[PDB]
A paper describes a structure:
[name] can be found intracellularly, where it is essential for virus replication, docked on lipid rafts of the cell surface membrane, and abundantly secreted into the bloodstream of infected individuals during the febrile phase. [name] is comprised of three distinct domains, an N-terminal hydrophobic β-roll dimerization domain (residues 1–29) formed by the intertwining of two protomers, an α/β-wing domain (residues 38–151) that extends out from the central β-ladder domain (residues 181–352) giving the dimer a distinct crossed shape. Here, we present high-resolution cryoEM structures of [name] recombinant secreted [name] ([name]) and its complexes with three human monoclonal antibodies (AA12, EB9, [name]), as well as evidence for [name] infection-derived secreted [name] (isNS1) binding to High Density Lipoprotein (HDL).
[name] [name] was incubated with Fab AA12, EB9, or [name]. In addition, [name] (AfNb), which binds to and increases the rigidity of the elbow linker between the variable and constant domains of the Fab LC, was added to aid in structure determination. Both the heavy and light chains of Fabs AA12, EB9, and [name] bind similarly to the surface of the [name] [name] wing and β-ladder connector subdomain region with an observable weak density for AfNb. Fab [name] dataset only had up to two fab molecules bound to the exposed faces of the tetramer across all the class averages and with fewer particles picked. While the lower avidity observed for [name] may be due to poorer sample quality or differences in data collection, it also correlates to being the weakest binder among the three. Among them, [name] was the weakest binder to MR766 by an order of magnitutde lower when compared to AA12 and EB9 (10−7 vs 10−8 nM range). [name] [name] remained tetrameric in all three cases, as seen in the 2D and 3D class averages, but the map density of one dimer was much weaker. Compared to the available structures, our study presents a new subset of antibody-[name] complex structures where the antibody binds between the wing and β-ladder domains of the [name] protein, highlighting the presence of novel B cell epitopes in [name] [name].
Author numbering:
A (entry chain E), E (entry chain F): 1 to 352
B (entry chain A): 1 to 215
C (entry chain G): 1 to 120
D (entry chain B), F (entry chain D): 1 to 225
Write the structure that this text describes.
């Protein structure tokens, strides 16, 4: 109900009751401890699904990877009691992440023998069985990508009295594609607004008209952004959207900036990504008529340590459209090197 | 536009027990979101392969499909007499969702020259002040018929109308009819009404038995 | 530009022969070709047509199941493989080059022809 | 009960009007799935009109965006569609396609929608006879031509359907004037030209109009001129 | 941005960065000081309006009237010092509210005088005359409705909310019909969402494909609701919105209900009104087929003070719509008496 | 600079095409004030197309539902509108209007948009004859007629402009065939019928066609019957 609400801008104390939006991306690791609903049923579901030819599962966000790594071998211990000749493995995430054509079913009955829910199962770690099951990772050679499910878990409830929130997740009963909304949120106040998610932070300001100010990214999802949690959903050109529609971008007039278009060849291969409208460290940008056309993004720093001190583009509004990542600094697609061929420059990975 | 869906070739011919392959290509990598639709004339379409790799329960498993980067294929191990229909390529990745141009499978049978006829207008039509000269073709194969008119060097340019029939169950050939209309005043301005025909199986025009003003 | 036929000869019934044709001043890789024969005292008649590589080819009823056609764009030559001859075949044979598209059904140049005979 | 699908609401409307379309269903629930409309133009392939999510979202194709409206009544498991500013080019057959790209699809019988300002008419029947330098065949090249009739259908039979061999009819084509045309042939060996009676029967069900025409090996007439 | 919070029912608590809202409806107009620009400059404003022919001013909300009532006599003191015969008279507001066809001008010069208006050592006094610049009230005789300006101010700062409470207001420089977004707010989270302002509060629930849950109203504002501070602004029909666009109702699929249409002929004469989906005491509603038509809203209690029991309607869905205020209970337009269609009941006049 | 509005970009296009039109501004800033497009049908009342708020909200009329789109530029103070899926009935005169009911309005000159499914050709001229049972008036009723010409403009003159008294030129009328037609008439006492020469000049600049047709009081010929 009540909140501290210390306004840094004018040092104001302010109290009442209403709705609260929190920035939780910066500290994702320690806020969660997931678990299925009665793993006795999850084991049966995974066993039944494998019989239909499904090979593995591709994660949708780092949260699911953390959950799978946490449960890890515990599944084999329970499976052993029923004599299941199957083994499950857990991999690792990579940027970006693709979809999964298939989906998981829901069992009609649970295991016939075995009444274990939770407990002593921490004291077992077995070896391979006659069959193998894989999840994420560098396992492109085991089974093709077209044999795995994707985005099949719902969020029944969020938040609990442990601080390792015992969020209950289970398989969806229906067929759907949109990103899970139970954790999404957004709000607007005065001359500021932001759309929030577990791994997304987008800020908008009103200087002149609604536009982009800053954004923080930890992962690239590929699920449709729910429209019913968006601001100003009127018709807008898909080109102008800075965040591509494919990368779970919001469908809002806020999500745009005049003079720039969709960025489908951005450095999505980077582990961590932040979008800021400031030039790369020590570099500079200009708007020029005779510059090159749209093309793959170029890193401002060469693999040999050489930096590029010239850039240009025609329709851009000066000076930056910059990306920030652990590996260095990049630029938007519209920007091109002024007097350097792309052959002698570190071309950004083209995942478009 | 976002996604374009292309099918090639447009049509192919085979016989009973032969192996036939159909290909479908996209403009960019969109994963394996793709399905094929089979359509029988006079009936509602149907879905046979879903997710580009799996077949639904039903007719025995003589259908196959695969993917390699950006190309797709559908093949029949052995053709059966009930497999002659139309097939379609469709994708459901990003809006707007498109469809393929389709492809047809038909029984194969051997070239035949057309029969070139011209049936006239009559007094019942000549009274109205407008007349139509119709060039008729019948029992020809393959589908390469062309029609032209050269009345006293006056070459026509996109004025006539044409239509085509079905292969017919038994004869297994095609027929065609070309029609052009003009007023009575211009109907009698010329005395030669010949429709020129070019077919891949022939070399020159033909001569027949009917005419205007010379019956 | 010119077209020249070759491969004529004589053989007993049930024999097999090979013919060829070529032209100059044009590239055949961009065009299809057709084959025709002229029966004794008869006008030119259809024999076979071959299309661009991988598009397919068509054979006449009188030749279906007997002969075969292939192209050699590298040297600008087209072969016709001929088997199981019976004396009725005796006729002159010609090679023709197709226009830009199969929709045309017309040719710009014609060959000189060659003679093929068979008897028992 | 088992799945059943039935469209309705079709008919003949004038240009510029509006109409509603419905697609009822039984068994499964329309609220928790994805539904879309598919139309097939005359003699063309399929085409996708619109899609509605189970969550209430909708997206429209370029050809129809800003003219249609779709909603579903979840109380009785029914789906409704609305269209405005109709035109002739929109004539086609529409299906409420269960376009589920993974599991499967159930399709209904469809419904026919027509837009045209034309308005029931009888056919006309004419005989023919060629000779000189323009038409050939070497056999009995006789037939009855049916023209200027609307709307469909019309049944054509010869000698009350007493013969079938060597009898076939050309498929019809719609002239720009709004009327149909076709042809029929009863070709037979020339030996039976003047020793048999030929009659072509034309039936126009919409107006109960029936016409007949007797075909004979008639020759030219040397009328005074 | 920095604050704390305690969940309504859950035990979750934290103090982290984010964006927060609280209701400001039932606080009943906290005692803010309202500096309408420098009163020295504002004195030159009304001079031109009266000179050009503006006689009265209508109110847009129950906040401008409070500012006028706060400043009052000091305005007359300025003209008394400068020697201009004019004054102001203030009434009370009645609902519904009506818009005005005029807007105030912007002076380019300051009144030449020693400003003794703001910060002076008390002693503010004046007398009454016949030159009345009436603002608000039913005094149409001195100034007809079509001669009154409306919504000719603009917010500049909402700070000092702790102790000084001096929201800065200044006359706008350009013409427009939209409201002032500087105080508007709206947010959504998970299964709940609500739109709020200084005089409205609407709650929408995620029970099934969104539907109106409950709302609170204190003044029937008729300003033009902005589109840039609302969610899901496309895909709705104006015939279904519970609050018609003329009444500043938000344009959103959230702002609707199943089985009901607009309520343009509702009981908009009360002072404070709350929308609740519940049957009023004693009364009940039956969904039948032989009911009447969409007539003007009818009061639930007869003029004699007794309640009316039986009603009917066709498109309704349990619970029925209802309006509740101090005067009593009112029902929806679609809901009419069942057995007797007699009009022997208190009825609301036509509104549009 | 002064306050003016200028239009540009009008022309001709076949049905189904698209075009871009601009509304430049001078002096004031288009961003601050409101804007709206207004079109005038030929010989009909004005119509309202769409509006754009200074805050960035737009509304479109039912006629252009889902076919138009308007955008504004801040760098050079210019306004743009896009049209898609044109049709014949859309032909009209377009111009942006400052629809502000507070201080005044500035309206641009405007430009025409034409939609035609057929096309350049010269006119025809024929003489006229009075008598029998349909027509009367008892005075010189001899003049020139122009029909089947396209496109505009054209002009009609008599005696190379030497004759001005009693000159009439009826407005051009568009037939269903997509061709223009007009008429020019003049009257004089019947006494001076055969004592003077009448000549009408017809000009069609788009086809560079000049046609002259001498007119005389022709009497009915007694040719063979
Ligand atoms: C008694 C009960 O559970 N009633 C439910 C109601 O709560 C829910 O809002 C509605 C949605 O259709 O379905 C019914
Ligand atoms: C706000 O927008 C204006 C108008 O484009 C621009 O000049 C200015 O730099 C922006 N920022 C601030 C802080 O005013």
């Amino acid at each position: 109900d009540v909140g501290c609400s210390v306004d840094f801008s004018k040092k104001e104390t302010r109290c009442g009751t209403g709705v609260f939006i929190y920035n939780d991306v910066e500290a994702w690791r320690d806020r969660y401890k997931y678990h299925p609903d009665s793993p006795r049923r999850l084991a049966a579901a995974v066993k039944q699904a494998w019989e239909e030819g499904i090979c593995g599962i591709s994660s949708v966000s780092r949260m699911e990877n953390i959950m799978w790594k946490s449960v890890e071998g515990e599944l084999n211990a329970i499976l052993e009691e029923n004599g299941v000749q199957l083994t499950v493995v857990v991999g690792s995430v990579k940027n970006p992440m693709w979809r999964g054509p298939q989906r998981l079913p829901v069992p009609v009955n649970e295991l016939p023998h075995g009444w274990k829910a939770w407990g002593k199962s921490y004291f077992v770690r077995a070896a391979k069985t006659n069959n193998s099951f894989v999840v994420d990772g560098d396992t492109l050679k085991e089974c093709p990508l077209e044999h795995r499910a994707w985005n099949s878990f719902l969020v029944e409830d969020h938040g609990f009295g442990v601080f390792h929130t015992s969020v209950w997740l289970k398989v969806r009963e229906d067929y759907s594609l949109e990103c899970d909304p139970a954790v999404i949120g957004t709000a607007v106040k005065g001359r500021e607004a932001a759309h929030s998610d577990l791994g997304y932070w987008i800020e908008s300001e009103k200087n002149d008209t609604w536009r982009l100010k800053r954004a923080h990214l930890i992962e690239m999802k590929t699920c449709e952004w729910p429209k019913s949690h968006t601001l100003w959903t009127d018709g807008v050109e898909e080109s102008d959207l800075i965040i591509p529609k494919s990368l779970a971008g919001p469908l809002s007039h806020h999500n745009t900036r005049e003079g720039y278009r969709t960025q489908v060849k951005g450095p999505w291969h980077s582990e961590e990504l932040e979008i800021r409208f400031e030039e790369c460290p020590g570099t500079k940008v200009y708007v020029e008529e005779t510059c090159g056309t749209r093309g793959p993004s170029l890193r401002s720093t060469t693999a040999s340590g050489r930096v590029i001190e010239e850039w240009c583009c025609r329709e851009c509004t000066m000076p930056p459209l910059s990306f920030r990542a652990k590996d260095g600094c990049w630029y938007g697609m519209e920007i091109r090197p002024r007097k350097e061929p792309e052959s002698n420059l570190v071309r950004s990975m083209v995942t478009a | 536009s976002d996604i374009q869906m292309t099918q090639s070739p447009f049509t192919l011919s085979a016989s009973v027990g032969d192996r036939v392959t159909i290909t479908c290509r996209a403009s960019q990598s969109i994963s394996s979101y793709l399905n094929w639709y089979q359509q029988k004339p006079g009936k509602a379409p149907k879905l046979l392969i879903y997710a580009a790799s799996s077949l639904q329960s039903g007719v025995p498993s003589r259908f196959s499909g695969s993917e390699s980067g950006t190309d797709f294929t559908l093949t029949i191990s052995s053709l059966q007499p009930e497999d002659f229909a139309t097939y379609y390529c469709q994708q459901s990745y990003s809006t707007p969702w498109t469809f393929g141009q389709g492809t047809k499978v038909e029984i194969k049978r051997t070239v035949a020259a057309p029969s070139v006829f011209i049936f006239p207008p009559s007094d019942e039509q000549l009274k109205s002040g407008t007349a139509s000269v119709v060039c008729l073709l019948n029992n020809f194969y393959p589908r390469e018929a062309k029609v032209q008119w050269k009345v006293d060097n006056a070459l026509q340019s996109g004025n006539s109308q044409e239509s085509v029939t079905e292969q017919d169950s038994k004869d297994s050939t095609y027929s065609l009819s070309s029609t052009l209309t003009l007023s009575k005043a211009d109907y009698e301005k010329h005395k030669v009404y010949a429709c020129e025909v070019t077919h891949q199986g022939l070399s020159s025009p033909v001569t027949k038995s009917f005419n205007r003003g010379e019956c | 530009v010119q077209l020249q036929e070759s491969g004529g000869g004589l053989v007993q019934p049930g024999g097999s022969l090979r013919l060829s044709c070529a032209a100059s001043g044009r590239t055949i890789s961009r065009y299809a070709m057709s084959w025709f024969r002229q029966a004794p005292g008869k006008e030119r008649e259809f024999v076979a047509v071959a299309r661009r590589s991988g598009d397919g080819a068509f054979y006449a009823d009188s030749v279906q199941g007997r002969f075969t056609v292939s192209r050699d764009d590298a040297k600008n030559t087209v072969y016709l493989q001929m088997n199981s001859l019976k004396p009725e075949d005796t006729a002159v044979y010609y090679c023709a080059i197709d226009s830009d598209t199969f929709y045309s059904g017309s040719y710009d140049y014609w060959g000189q022809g060659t003679q093929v005979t068979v008897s028992s | 009960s088992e799945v059943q699908l039935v469209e309705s609401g079709g008919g003949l409307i004038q240009p510029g009007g509006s109409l509603r379309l419905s697609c009822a269903a039984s068994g499964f629930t329309v609220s928790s799935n994805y539904m879309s409309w598919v139309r097939q133009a005359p003699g063309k392939g399929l085409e996708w009109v619109s899609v509605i999510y189970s969550g209430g979202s909708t997206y429209y194709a370029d050809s129809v965006k800003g003219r249609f409206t779709i909603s579903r009544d979840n109380s009785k498991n029914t789906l409704y569609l609305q269209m405005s500013s109709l035109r002739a080019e929109d004539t086609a057959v529409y299906y409420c396609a269960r376009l589920i790209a993974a599991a499967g699809d159930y399709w209904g019988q469809g419904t026919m929608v027509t837009v045209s300002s034309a308005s029931t008419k009888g056919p006309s029947v004419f005989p023919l006879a060629p000779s000189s330098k323009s038409t050939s065949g070497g056999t009995a090249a006789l037939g009855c031509l049916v023209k200027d009739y609307f709307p469909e259908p019309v049944t054509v039979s010869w000698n009350s359907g007493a013969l079938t061999s060597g009898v076939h009819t050309f498929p019809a084509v719609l002239q720009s004037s709004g009327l149909y045309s076709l042809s029929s042939v009863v070709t037979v060996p020339s030996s039976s030209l003047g020793t048999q009676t030929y009659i072509c029967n034309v039936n126009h069900k919409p107006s109960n109009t029936k016409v007949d025409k007797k075909v004979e090996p008639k020759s030219c007439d040397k009328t005074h001129t």
